[PDB]
Each structure stands twice: as C-alpha cells, then as structure tokens.
Amino acid sequence: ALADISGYLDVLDSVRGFSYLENAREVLRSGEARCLGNPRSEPEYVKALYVIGASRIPVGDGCSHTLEELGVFDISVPGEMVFPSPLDFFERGKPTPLVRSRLQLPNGVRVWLKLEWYNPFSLSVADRPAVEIISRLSRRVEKGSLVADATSSNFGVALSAVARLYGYRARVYLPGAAEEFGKLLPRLLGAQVIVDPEAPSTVHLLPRVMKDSKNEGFVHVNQFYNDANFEAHMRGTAREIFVQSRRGGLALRGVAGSLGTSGHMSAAAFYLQSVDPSIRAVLVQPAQGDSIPGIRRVETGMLWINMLDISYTLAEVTLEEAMEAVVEVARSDGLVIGPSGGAAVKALAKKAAEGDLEPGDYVVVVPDTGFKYLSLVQNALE
Numbered sequence: 001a002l003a004d005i006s007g008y009l010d011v012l013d014s015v016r017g018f019s020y021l022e023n024a025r026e027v028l029r030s031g032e033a034r035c036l037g038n039p040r041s042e043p044e045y046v047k048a049l050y051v052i053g054a055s056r057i058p059v060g061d062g063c064s065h066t067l068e069e070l071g072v073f074d075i076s077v078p079g080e081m082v083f084p085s086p087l088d089f090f091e092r093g094k095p096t097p098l099v100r101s102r103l104q105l106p107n108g109v110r111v112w113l114k115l116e117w118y119n120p121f122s123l124s125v126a127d128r129p130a131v132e133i134i135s136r137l138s139r140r141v142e143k144g145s146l147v148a149d150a151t152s153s154n155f156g157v158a159l160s161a162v163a164r165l166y167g168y169r170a171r172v173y174l175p176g177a178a179e180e181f182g183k184l185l186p187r188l189l190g191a192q193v194i195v196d197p198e199a200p201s202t203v204h205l206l207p208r209v210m211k212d213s214k215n216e217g218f219v220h221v222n223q224f225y226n227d228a229n230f231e232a233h234m235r236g237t238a239r240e241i242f243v244q245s246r247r248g249g250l251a252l253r254g255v256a257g258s259l260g261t262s263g264h265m266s267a268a269a270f271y272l273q274s275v276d277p278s279i280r281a282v283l284v285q286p287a288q289g290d291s292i293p294g295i296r297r298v299e300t301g302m303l304w305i306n307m308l309d310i311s312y313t314l315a316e317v318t319l320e321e322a323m324e325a326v327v328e329v330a331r332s333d334g335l336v337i338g339p340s341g342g343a344a345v346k347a348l349a350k351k352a353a354e355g356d357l358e359p360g361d362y363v364v365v366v367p368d369t370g371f372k373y374l375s376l377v378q379n380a381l382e
C-alpha cells in the first residue's frame with residue numbers, strides 16, 4: 001500500500017551514517033522495494049527511499065512496490081511552467097534540461113549536456129545543496145539566526161538567496177581569486193561577504209570559518225561535509241539523469257563531471273552504478289598548478305567521492321583546455337557553458353580518444369553558464 005513519504009521526513013534529522021545507502025542501492029538495482037509493516041521502525045529504509053526520489057513509501061505486510069508506484073518517476077513540472085513562489089519553482093521546476101550536443105566525439109561517444117544553470121537562484125548546480133541544507137536547518141534552527149560557509153562563489157550566492165527565503169541571515173567567505181559575482185551577488189541578496197585575498201582556495205578558508213563559528217555562534221552549514229549536499233543530488237541531479245535517460249530512450253553508458261565538494265558527481269556516479277555497475281564516471285582533475293573555478297584535484301580531500309562504493313576514472317585538464325572546450329561547445333551548440341563544464345566535456349573527449357569507453361550516450365553535467373566568466377572567455381580568445 002502506498003503512503004506519502006512527507007509524514008516520515010523526521011528520519012532525515014534522525015538517521016546517521018551511510019548504512020542506509022545499501023537499501024538505496026538494493027531498491028535501485030531491483031526496481032522494487034518491499035512493503036514495510038511498521039515504517040516507523042525502519043528509519044533507514046525510509047531514508048534510502050527519500051534519497052532515491054520516492055514520494056511514497058510501501059506500507060503493509062508481504063507486498064512490494066515498483067520505483068514507479070513509489071514516485072521515482074513522477075512528473076513534477078507543470079506543463080505551463082507557472083509557479084506560485086520562487087521556492088516551489090526550484091522544487092517543481094525540474095528536471096534541468098538534458099540536451100544532445102551537436103559535437104562529435106571519436107569512437108561513437110554521444111554527448112548530452114545537463115544544464116545546471118537552469119536553477120533559479122545561483123544559475124548553477126549549487127542551488128540544490130543550498131535548498132536541501134537550509135530546508136533541514138529550518139526545523140531546529142531559529143529564524144533570524146545567521147548561517148555561513150566557504151564558497152568558490154556559486155554556493156554562497158545560492159545560500160544567500162535560500163537563507164533569506166527561509167528567514168535566516170547569511171555570511172559568505174571567499175578566496176581572493178574567486179569570480180566577482182560571488183563577492184558581489186550575496187551583498188545584493190543581503191548576505192555579508194568576507195574576502196580573504198590571501199586564501200589560495202576555498203578549503204583553505206574552512207579553519208577561519210570554524211573558529212569564527214565558535215566565536216560568533218553562527219551555524220556553519222559546511223557543504224564540504226554536510227550530507228544534505230549528496231542527498232540533494234541523489235534525489236535531484238542523479239535521479240534525473242536516470243529518469244531522463246530511461247525516458248529520453250538513451251542507451252546510457254556513462255557520466256562525466258567535475259568535483260568541488262564532490263557532492264553531485266558522487267551522487268550521479270552512485271545512483272547510476274546501482275542501476276548498472278558498468279556505467280562509467282569520467283571525472284576531471286584540474287592539471288596541477290591550474291585552477292578551474294569551482295573545482296579542484298581529488299586528493300585535496302573530498303568526502304563522498306572517496307567514502308562510498310563508486311567506480312570512477314580521472315582525466316587531467318588544463319585551464320587552457322577547459323576553455324578551448326567552452327569555445328568548441330559555444331561554436332557547435334550556441335550554448336555558453338562555464339569552465340568546469342568545459343573541463344568535464346574535455347575529460348569526456350580525452351577518454352573518448354583513448355578508446356577507453358563503450359560507445360553510447362554519455363551525460364556531461366554542466367555546473368553553470370559561461371556568462372559568469374567573461375575575463376576567462378577574453379583570455380581564451382587570446
């Protein structure tokens with residue numbers, strides 16, 4: 001029998017660790033889930049289900065229910081694209097678009113692009129962890145309270161916006177080398193902003209954020225470590241690739257993307273590999289000495305990418321290559337992607353060249369719009 005999952009979302013604040021994820025892998029692999037006699041007594045299974053994009057739980061004794069009956073596949077978008085609030089627009093205004101590139105790759109590698117700039121607040125994939133995180137604070141953190149984090153830019157803009165929609169004030173911390181929008185848009189959205197012109201990176205900022213949190217009592221939401229990040233991509237980004245492939249009738253063979261927190265690629269890799277372990281995951285490694293906005297090398301220490309049972313393949317990419325791929329994509333598709341998108345595309349194109357890859361459809365995740373990167377565009381034009 002089917003029940004509305006929303007009555008059981010206390011399990012999100014309750015359940016700790018990664019054990020539940022074996023329930024999620026199992027249900028995804030099987031296409032079904034067993035009826036729960038006493039749903040309350042199985043917080044971890046319930047959590048696994050929410051995590052996969054279900055809106056109903058199976059309830060009763062003996063039966064089971066399909067991913068479809070569970071709502072993994074519900075259409076959320078109103079056909080007329082009319083939303084009663086910005087938040088509902090974030091929620092229901094999904095999936096982001098999966099678009100086939102006109103770009104040709106060797107060895108029968110067919111590229112689609114998932115355009116994450118189609119999120120309303122930061123015009124980036126960071127909208128998703130910002131909503132999911134803040135949403136959870138919402139129940140036990142007092143309105144009016146200040147929340148804060150290190151950001152490369154995207155996260156901070158997104159967070160600043162979502163926090164205000166929720167009653168919170170916001171503070172964002174950025175390295176000197178971050179984009180100017182990251183430093184300026186939060187203020188517009190009414191957050192405070194701190195720029196450390198010294199910090200050679202986002203992560204380098206975490207110590208001062210933590211200390212400051214201890215001192216000032218603000219809540220440090222920590223995207224780098226907060227599981228509402230990966231869970232947000234599991235139920236959004238990753239479910240969507242799954243659903244978009246099955247329904248777009250793609251013969252899905254792999255995904256490609258970049259890594260900052262590592263949240264979205266981890267979810268996409270995890271979720272899809274549960275459905276078929278042969279699904280590849282091609283990941284970018286900014287060539288050492290190079291900086292590609294929003295992303296970094298794998299061994300700089302990332303939570304989920306390392307900690308979960310995920311198969312993946314690294315490729316290096318310079319700033320110069322990532323940009324040449326912005327230009328390639330701009331000229332084929334008339335889509336202006338950002339540097340991490342460029343890199344992700346290039347990583348996919350390198351692996352294509354080596355003949356590493358089973359030929360088929362490959363979904364590349366584009367984190368944001370190239371519009372935000374005009375002086376790198378300027379540099380890439382020489």
Ligand SMILES: CC(=O)OC[C@H](NCc1c(COP(=O)(O)O)cnc(C)c1O)C(=O)O
Nearest residue numbers: 151152154155260261262263264294340367
């Ligand atoms: C350095 C860092 O991790 O910045 C994190 C946020 N940017 C995310 C981001 C990514 C990577 O997605 P994820 O963090 O692995 O899930 C890729 N490209 C861009 C342009 C991004 O902004 C942040 O903004 O703080």
